[PDB]
């Protein structure tokens, strides 16, 4: 697949659609969550798109590579560390980051797994704190969706 | 993947959580269904995992071999084709599939696609339309959800 798509939902008010288009030998999320509040919002690609129990049922970052949690732009990342989202005044974040290490087939395909958008920002694994470097102290998983082949 | 997971949701009260499992070389598919009328229904693997239109973004069967839509046991038939569910009187259907030609992995992978229980009997490609040769007449669909990776 070259094409995925992913539609995020949660028990609150937190809503939005990704795209994934497979560009070469990066990936180009697109897509816009809303109903957030203002400010910077943990993005990743959880292991399991297991959503019988919501969004906890995702598991953990999707980490093949067994890192440690890092921002997007680090070389010791999880593969689905993809940073942050930023919703405006509004609470709408409009989503547009090109990822090197999260792909649409082969082994760190994320096809089956679950987009997952957090309460608190993604402190990038630099908070001097032993959560920093597992999760980035994102919190809560406020809206979720497994990714899916889209046309 | 060797487990998959979809949990079954719609705009009614269908819903249901389907389990995949590769044994051997075969997959396993078990699950229940809730919520639906007495009788057979409809059950396919839908070729997109594509729910920003409710189930109607799922696209038609899987059908890479492209054949004409049949039942589970024909030859002639499409790699989403799994027959039909049964719901007793007070709306439970136990599935309970083994099937060849689905798989977690690999080309006829289901993994990212999306798993539709629909209104109607399917008449396994058997009803003498040409609707029949396309969905089994099998109707609308109730409930859907994208097939993700479980643990
Ligand atoms: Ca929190
Ligand atoms: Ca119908
Ligand atoms: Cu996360
Ligand atoms: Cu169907
Ligand atoms: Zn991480
Ligand atoms: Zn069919």
């Given at each position: 697949?070259?094409?995925?798509?992913?539609?995020?939902?949660?028990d609150?008010?937190?809503?939005?659609?990704?795209?994934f288009?497979?560009?070469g030998?990066?990936?180009?999320?697109?897509?816009?969550?809303?109903?957030?509040?203002?400010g910077?919002?943990?993005?990743?690609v959880?292991?399991?798109?297991?959503?019988?129990?919501?969004?906890?049922?995702?598991?953990?970052?999707?980490?093949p590579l067994?890192?440690?949690?890092?921002?997007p732009?680090?070389?010791?990342?999880?593969?689905?560390?993809?940073?942050?989202?930023?919703?405006?005044?509004?609470?709408?974040?409009?989503?547009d980051?090109?990822?090197?290490?999260?792909?649409?087939?082969?082994?760190?395909?994320?096809?089956?797994?679950?987009?997952?958008?957090?309460?608190?920002?993604?402190?990038?694994?630099?908070?001097g704190?032993?959560?920093?470097?597992?999760?980035?102290?994102?919190?809560?998983?406020?809206?979720?969706?497994?990714?899916?082949?889209?046309?």
């Amino acid at each position: 697949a070259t094409k995925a798509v992913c539609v995020l939902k949660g028990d609150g008010p937190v809503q939005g659609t990704i795209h994934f288009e497979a560009k070469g030998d990066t990936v180009v999320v697109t897509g816009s969550i809303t109903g957030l509040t203002e400010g910077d919002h943990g993005f990743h690609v959880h292991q399991f798109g297991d959503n019988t129990q919501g969004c906890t049922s995702a598991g953990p970052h999707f980490n093949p590579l067994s890192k440690k949690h890092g921002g997007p732009k680090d070389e010791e990342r999880h593969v689905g560390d993809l940073g942050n989202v930023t919703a405006d005044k509004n609470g709408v974040a409009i989503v547009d980051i090109v990822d090197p290490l999260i792909s649409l087939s082969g082994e760190y395909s994320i096809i089956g797994r679950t987009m997952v958008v957090h309460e608190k920002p993604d402190d990038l694994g630099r908070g001097g704190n032993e959560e920093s470097t597992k999760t980035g102290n994102a919190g809560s998983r406020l809206a979720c969706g497994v990714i899916g082949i889209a046309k």
